[PDB]
Design a protein around this ligand. Structure first.
Ligand SMILES: *[C@@H]1O[C@H](CO)[C@@H](O[C@@H]2O[C@H](CO)[C@@H](O[C@@H]3O[C@H](CO[C@H]4O[C@H](CO[C@H]5O[C@H](CO)[C@@H](O)[C@H](O)[C@@H]5O[C@H]5O[C@H](CO)[C@@H](O)[C@H](O)[C@@H]5O)[C@@H](O)[C@H](O[C@H]5O[C@H](CO)[C@@H](O)[C@H](O)[C@@H]5O)[C@@H]4O)[C@@H](O)[C@H](O[C@H]4O[C@H](CO)[C@@H](O)[C@H](O)[C@@H]4O[C@H]4O[C@H](CO)[C@@H](O)[C@H](O)[C@@H]4O[C@H]4O[C@H](CO)[C@@H](O)[C@H](O)[C@@H]4O)[C@@H]3O)[C@H](O)[C@H]2NC(C)=O)[C@H](O)[C@H]1NC(C)=O
Ligand SMILES: *[C@@H]1O[C@H](CO)[C@@H](O[C@@H]2O[C@H](CO)[C@@H](O[C@@H]3O[C@H](CO[C@H]4O[C@H](CO[C@H]5O[C@H](CO)[C@@H](O)[C@H](O)[C@@H]5O[C@H]5O[C@H](CO)[C@@H](O)[C@H](O)[C@@H]5O)[C@@H](O)[C@H](O[C@H]5O[C@H](CO)[C@@H](O)[C@H](O)[C@@H]5O)[C@@H]4O)[C@@H](O)[C@H](O[C@H]4O[C@H](CO)[C@@H](O)[C@H](O)[C@@H]4O[C@H]4O[C@H](CO)[C@@H](O)[C@H](O)[C@@H]4O[C@H]4O[C@H](CO)[C@@H](O)[C@H](O)[C@@H]4O)[C@@H]3O)[C@H](O)[C@H]2NC(C)=O)[C@H](O)[C@H]1NC(C)=O
Ligand SMILES: *[C@@H]1O[C@H](CO)[C@@H](O[C@@H]2O[C@H](CO)[C@@H](O[C@@H]3O[C@H](CO[C@H]4O[C@H](CO[C@H]5O[C@H](CO)[C@@H](O)[C@H](O)[C@@H]5O[C@H]5O[C@H](CO)[C@@H](O)[C@H](O)[C@@H]5O)[C@@H](O)[C@H](O[C@H]5O[C@H](CO)[C@@H](O)[C@H](O)[C@@H]5O)[C@@H]4O)[C@@H](O)[C@H](O[C@H]4O[C@H](CO)[C@@H](O)[C@H](O)[C@@H]4O[C@H]4O[C@H](CO)[C@@H](O)[C@H](O)[C@@H]4O[C@H]4O[C@H](CO)[C@@H](O)[C@H](O)[C@@H]4O)[C@@H]3O)[C@H](O)[C@H]2NC(C)=O)[C@H](O)[C@H]1NC(C)=O
Ligand SMILES: *[C@@H]1O[C@H](CO)[C@@H](O[C@@H]2O[C@H](CO)[C@@H](O[C@@H]3O[C@H](CO[C@H]4O[C@H](CO[C@H]5O[C@H](CO)[C@@H](O)[C@H](O)[C@@H]5O[C@H]5O[C@H](CO)[C@@H](O)[C@H](O)[C@@H]5O)[C@@H](O)[C@H](O[C@H]5O[C@H](CO)[C@@H](O)[C@H](O)[C@@H]5O)[C@@H]4O)[C@@H](O)[C@H](O[C@H]4O[C@H](CO)[C@@H](O)[C@H](O)[C@@H]4O[C@H]4O[C@H](CO)[C@@H](O)[C@H](O)[C@@H]4O[C@H]4O[C@H](CO)[C@@H](O)[C@H](O)[C@@H]4O)[C@@H]3O)[C@H](O)[C@H]2NC(C)=O)[C@H](O)[C@H]1NC(C)=O
Ligand SMILES: *[C@@H]1O[C@H](CO)[C@@H](O[C@@H]2O[C@H](CO)[C@@H](O)[C@H](O)[C@H]2NC(C)=O)[C@H](O)[C@H]1NC(C)=O
Ligand SMILES: [Ca+2]
Ligand SMILES: [Ca+2]
Ligand SMILES: [Ca+2]
Ligand SMILES: [Ca+2]
Lengths: 388, 388, 388, 388
């Protein structure tokens, strides 16, 4: 095998088709499904898999009580077959910890997990299912990473980490790994003022990451990485179609180089595909809560501070719970272009459904079509009442 | 690997032997078996598997309530090892949706799933476990396909779809796929007046599909496809041995080019092998309900409007529930001829057994023998009382 | 791969060491273990597996009620990894039916299952996991076979079948299969008067089968097969160490060419290794019930009508339940000789433990050592009280 | 494949990073997890796995009652994927018995299990998943071995066994195996006075084993093996940092060539890495019970009878239960040096938690880093109250 190179551009996105769905919470009502959160999807050359952070308990298990909590010693990055649920018996542990990323370089996979207490966390970088490098916290405040796949080019796999405050300036670093070793790292540059939970995709030798400015911004920061030069830029999505959550109502003009204000110290992981007129943004439908999900075609969102939607697709109704969302692509598919894909985490349980003591999720995932397909909505589908 | 070619004829069918049986409902009374319906069987060059549409819940799970319903966001095409039950832990999701087909071309497998609301459904065509093509509804009324395997010849895999009314003229199309791409499609031609749920098999470079005329016909429509020319014909089975369900009692003379009347707006998926004097038809034993199943040797059923049985085999007694049935063959077996095989879906639960709130099925499957073997009957075997 | 040839002799048997044990009934008290009976062991070139006839239900499942019964539509030959229990999720179905054998020829595996009602049973012979040949009942009375592995030589795999009475003369046939096809079959010849449930092993181009004379004999019949000539002989084990069950107490002189009388119309499957002074016989310890199990070294048992034990090994105490026993070897092991192995089926439940409504078993298996090893006893280990 | 050679030295150990954790007791509260104890970790060239001795029951199973007991017929050496729990469905049985070791030689794996009653135990040596050699008890008193991985060099895999008293002189033997055959064995030599449960690692053609002197010593005996010459030495760790349990408080000067006294007839399996100034010792934090676990950097512990810690890392708080600990390395990793790894068995249940009737464990495992990483603590994480 050779290292994959990002040689193709994005396919034209005219709609989104269903790719995978695991129905995990429905199935886990009466089967040995692990409690998870922070899911994503990532492809190897011969298979695509679901990934997430386990909570080290099943959902009917008594240890599900307390699983609203993000960071414990009982979490691990797990992967499992596409559209199956994450069960005790089919889930492969990639590494231990409570913040992760993972990506295949064309030869093998790199997985990164961070663990530790808040003031003394460390990342372990695994390559070919063996630990290779470790990175200690630099700011002693919840060293943390993407929670979705990284992207590689000719073996170089950039990863974005943050360490420091979630409610003020933090120390974001872009590490460039190859075979699990650090080639270089850079501090964040550009005009993004705070970065968390980057969602990345690659095309024609450039990696684009759409992130969460938890501190100030209801527009999303965008990091664009050149994995050959190992350099990057940052800015915000300029569009007034604001895509964090919670957020204020949409303005008529957005901000390119600073956080669009109105909501502080909160957010949600999300994503976009930024490709000129072939630009699609995801967001929650609710401005207040992690409810609903929609895709909006917003031509030139990155650069046009008045850009508005020209097309859209509902993914999850506003009467159903959503969650984190992120990008992935199958870089090893046939054809002339890369097909944009994404997932949405469908969070069930706490805090919004507090008649149960757990928090878990299921996954829905879609990829782009060049057809203009009909739309359905894709809720989690479980009845909370059944768990009482 | 090369693409498989349909170079062989059918083996002489002198009786049927047991091939597979999953006992899913029996086993699922106390194990994590998924609720399914619309099962089938399909072979790869190195393995044969069971397939079905999951309902995204186990049968003891509380979400089994409601699973009489055909179309939800929680359904998927799954496959699993021959004669195992479809469990949470052993079932591989092929694609998401509520109407499917799947077939191996000798190189890899194509799977097709349709999802969406009734007025805005779309098919996704997967090849080599990746999405390749999508097709939007053309009639905005439950785009739907075979619910059993397709057949390929030199890479060309025809698939029959219908969109439109179930109780009047609809828009049936035969798509010819290769490597998941559309080579051509044709509207239905010939004298079949309504088509659903085609059951297909191939022999000497011709594909024969036996279908369901839900609107008018208690004889079954037959589509015969030339996958090289990519053309087809349609007619009905001429025989007065009527094989849909519900149906009127058998006449003495059938109809070749129009629906044999008496029952409207209903049916069941079924199949036949039409090979001159080596012709066998399956049907339910009951004329009124999906009860029993039998195979009848009906020489020249396709073309002889007075043909009657010369031999038969009971598969399921009329005191046991049946369901859909369909054809498959192992195109990669050794020997000089293709051995005809079929399955019967053994439906349990609603609507006929309404003391439970679910609907599920198990599978029995048989293939032909050149011996004249003794017959057994093959019920599902579960006791509904145990589920109360 | 080439066909395996029986080129080696037996290793010297100086004691028996533990090979595998599945603890199935213990584990199945709280896990999804299938109800089984009639287990055995068989090796492929790269793996050894446990085999048995499933009852198509788990042991905690309500459908376990009734599983004392031998023949139903819900049985299948299953295999699973050595020393694991036979679970819903890890068990591979080989074929459907209620009497089986299976063996690897060095290239691939042949499996045979018989199904049907008592008066109309049929065998299906699978090779390379595909059905190849079928054989209809010839006597219309429970066509039945070995219930342990067959043995192959240069592709020729003899199998012993019986059809007819269990309590008087029956029609036993030795079929010689190659690639699942019938080369030849012979009726039983020699002086054995009734044959069931043969337990076979091969060495230096000869296959030895030790069987059950259910009608009259408490000595066991022995069939010796030349798989090159495709001919056989039969006789009884001459030794007065009688090894069927139930049986009379041991005499001082046995019978070579007729059944040793005293017990009629009953028996148990069992085995022996007959190799001159390297001869070991297994038997139940109890003369009355399937209780205990022991191995006795009985030099020249086959030919010496006064032969008595010179050494022994207790396998299962007489205060624990046993069951069927049979031979297998790993024909693909390293070294200069074939190591004799056997299993014992440890039957739990009905009829001897009738406070539960099921019948199931676990497996213990041992192979020979050239050391004189210490002995343990190997009970099933489950507490029936836990199942109430 | 060629046999692995121990060509590399140890990596510099500046801290320990998380490697694996299975959360077995947490997950097994509501999933089919086997009861285990005596776990370890061992790598093949393409995978690392967890190993342990099953008790032949799940933890919620009623047969979990009594599993404080060390030796029964229902135990087996099992392996399963790294960081998964040992479940009924994912656990591979390596061999049957109640004392084990296992190691890969670069070509295939050798596994050794001992079974039998106390006065008549025997070891079976498996190679390439087949039994090859057997060894009968020589002292008729609980023949027993390492309970963690062995190490191979050019095919030669030394294993340490003991047979005899646990509370006075016993008969320890070092067997040198190749392809599962005995090349040689030696009686223990040197100044260690009692040996059990050796924990081994290899580097630059030498194997170092740190063991348990159950009889007298609260310092640990160390056996150093030359696998080319097939010779060994023994002594004790000289350091006054005493690392058995229970033990007296730490002195200022230890003992090189005799047991450091104060505690008799007890101990725990443990380990060390002895590499000059790159020397790390593990131990329980409690001097009295199997509570807590810590790593201490104790330069020249082996040879310096006043050596004290210069650095350390807490693995398990003293308010959490620990257990056995042992060494392993991935001899097939990339790079210039072998990375030291270890595990800790986190024992739950009896005798310390006697409100439940079972004894089981989970596993945490770590490997060395050349960074100075932040430390977390890694408890089992289960709530005993949930099991009542
Ligand atoms: C079967 O499945 C089919 C496929 O899925 C399905 O069809 C799909 O239907 C859905 C639902 O209708 C469609 O999705 C929507 O698409 C809208 C965009 O399309 C409309 O607008 C464009 C653009 O129109 C402007 O620009 C063009 C030129 O490019 C001009 O030509 C126009 O005149 C117009 O110009 C004015 O405005 C511009 C600036 O905005 C100026 O530049 C300009 O000078 C003028 O001022 C049109 O081109 C479209 O028409 C074409 O398509 C339609 C078919 O849809 C045809 O009938 C027609 O012939 C044309 O071909 C079309 O009119 C999205 O706007 C829309 O998303 C908004 O609404 C939803 C709620 O429905 C919100 O959730 C979403 O967030 C968007 O609204 C919010 O955000 C915006 C942006 O800030 C706010 O302005 C807005 O107020 C609202 O904010 C509020 O909610 C927010 C969210 O909660 C909150 O955050 C805010 O704070 C605030 O509270 C939606 O995505 C989809 O595209 C169809 N797809 C296809 C292929 O057709 C079909 O229905 C199904 N069938 C059945 C039977 O069910
Ligand atoms: C061990 O296992 C063995 C293997 O399984 C098992 O043997 C099998 O037994 C079963 C059960 O008996 C057999 O299955 C049946 O087979 C019947 C056909 O075979 C009979 O008929 C043929 C044909 O006979 C005509 O034609 C030949 C020439 O080809 C002439 O020679 C004849 O004289 C006769 O001619 C007249 O009729 C023709 C028109 O029909 C005219 O052309 C002609 O001029 C004359 O008018 C015979 O050849 C057969 O004989 C041979 O075999 C038998 C052995 O079976 C030997 O004894 C004998 O020597 C010969 O070798 C034989 O007589 C099927 O018809 C039958 O299926 C009908 O019945 C079942 C109920 O049993 C129905 O469920 C089924 O649907 C069929 O009936 C319905 O449908 C027809 C068609 O429309 C209706 O006419 C009929 O009224 C009925 O309709 C009703 O029910 C429907 C369903 O609910 C409903 O929809 C309707 O609306 C209506 O309500 C059945 O399949 C099987 O073949 C055996 N197999 C073998 C290899 O032997 C054995 O028993 C087992 N042992 C034990 C101990 O258990
Ligand atoms: C640690 O583990 C160790 C390894 O496992 C374990 O050692 C093992 O111990 C077990 C138990 O003791 C041993 O197993 C038994 O072995 C017996 C055979 O060995 C004895 O006999 C031989 C043969 O002796 C005759 O022949 C030789 C020459 O070859 C002469 O030298 C002798 O003098 C004697 O000759 C007379 O008899 C012959 C005819 O029978 C004539 O030919 C001759 O002229 C004379 O008349 C001796 O060689 C043996 O000695 C050697 O070994 C011992 C060690 O065992 C040493 O001390 C000694 O120095 C020698 O080296 C030895 O004496 C088996 O017979 C025995 O099986 C019978 O008993 C059990 C019950 O225990 C029954 O279950 C079993 O079925 C057998 O009895 C039944 O069947 C026979 C046959 O028909 C009947 O005769 C008998 O009455 C009984 O029938 C009844 O029960 C049946 C079953 O229910 C029922 O069906 C009947 O109807 C009836 O009701 C048993 O297998 C084993 O071999 C040891 N292994 C080793 C390697 O040592 C050790 O104990 C463990 N340690 C601890 C501490 O636990
Ligand atoms: C984020 O994560 C970080 C990384 O994990 C974490 O940092 C880590 O913190 C932990 C906890 O503090 C550190 O772990 C401890 O490390 C201690 C060793 O380090 C100290 O000592 C050395 C050595 O000092 C001597 O020698 C040097 C020269 O080599 C001289 O320079 C010194 O002056 C001193 O010399 C005297 O003593 C010598 C003999 O002992 C003589 O030779 C000499 O002449 C003098 O007499 C220092 O070098 C270290 O300083 C350096 O590092 C610190 C940072 O830690 C810096 O601040 C500093 O600038 C330097 O760079 C340092 O001072 C271990 O001793 C310690 O383990 C003992 O304590 C724990 C309890 O905490 C016990 O559980 C453990 O068992 C050890 O104590 C027992 O055993 C000893 C030995 O017998 C007994 O003496 C002792 O009494 C006690 O016994 C009792 O308990 C036993 C167990 O129950 C029982 O069995 C006995 O019977 C008895 O009851 C511990 O491991 C770790 O190393 C840090 N790591 C790093 C990289 O920094 C950081 O905190 C985290 N951040 C947050 C915010 O949480
Ligand atoms: C099915 O028939 C096709 C058409 O003849 C065979 O296709 C040829 O395959 C050869 C061998 O791979 C190629 O080099 C030719 O170029 C192919 N020809 C065409 C016209 O496509 C194919 O091999 C046949 N399949 C099998 C299993 O034999
Ligand atoms: Ca924000
Ligand atoms: Ca109809
Ligand atoms: Ca008998
Ligand atoms: Ca000690």
């Amino acid at each position: 095998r050779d290292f994959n190179n990002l040689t193709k551009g994005l396919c034209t996105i005219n709609s989104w088709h269903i790719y995978g769905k695991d129905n995990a919470v429905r199935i886990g009502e009466d089967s040995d499904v692990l409690v998870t959160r922070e899911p994503y999807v990532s492809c190897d050359p011969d298979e695509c898999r679901f990934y997430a952070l386990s909570q080290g308990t099943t959902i009917r298990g008594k240890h599900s009580n307390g699983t609203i909590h993000d960071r414990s010693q009982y979490r691990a990055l797990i992967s499992w077959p596409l559209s199956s649920p994450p069960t005790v018996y089919n889930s492969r542990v990639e590494c231990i910890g409570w913040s992760s990323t993972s990506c295949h370089d064309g030869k093998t996979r790199m997985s990164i997990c961070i663990s530790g207490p808040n003031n003394n966390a460390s990342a372990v970088i695994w390559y070919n299912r063996r630990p290779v490098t470790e990175i200690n916290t630099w700011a002693r405040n919840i060293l943390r990473t993407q929670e979705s796949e990284c992207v590689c080019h000719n073996g170089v796999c950039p990863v974005v980490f943050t360490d420091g405050s979630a409610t003020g300036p933090a120390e974001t670093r872009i590490y460039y790994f190859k075979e699990g070793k650090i080639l270089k790292w850079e501090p964040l540059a550009g005009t993004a003022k705070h970065i968390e939970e980057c969602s990345c995709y690659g095309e024609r030798a450039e990696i684009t990451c759409t992130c969460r400015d938890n501190w100030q911004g209801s527009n999303r920061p965008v990091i664009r990485i050149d994995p050959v030069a190992m350099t990057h830029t940052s800015q915000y999505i300029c569009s007034p179609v604001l895509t964090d959550n919670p957020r204020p109502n949409d303005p008529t003009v957005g901000k390119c180089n600073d956080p669009y204000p109105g909501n502080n110290n909160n957010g949600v992981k999300g994503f976009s595909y930024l490709d000129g007129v072939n630009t699609w943004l995801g967001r929650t439908i609710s401005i207040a809560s992690r409810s609903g999900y929609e895709m909006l075609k917003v031509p030139n969102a990155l650069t046009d501070d008045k850009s508005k939607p020209t097309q859209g697709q509902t993914i999850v109704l506003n009467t159903d719970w959503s969650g984190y969302s992120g990008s992935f692509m199958d870089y090893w598919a046939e054809g002339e272009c890369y097909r944009a894909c994404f997932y949405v985490e469908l969070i069930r349980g706490r805090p919004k459904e507090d008649k149960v003591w757990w928090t878990s999720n299921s996954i829905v995932s879609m990829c782009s079509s060049t057809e203009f397909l009909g739309q359905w909505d894709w809720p989690d589908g479980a009845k909370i009442e059944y768990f009482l």
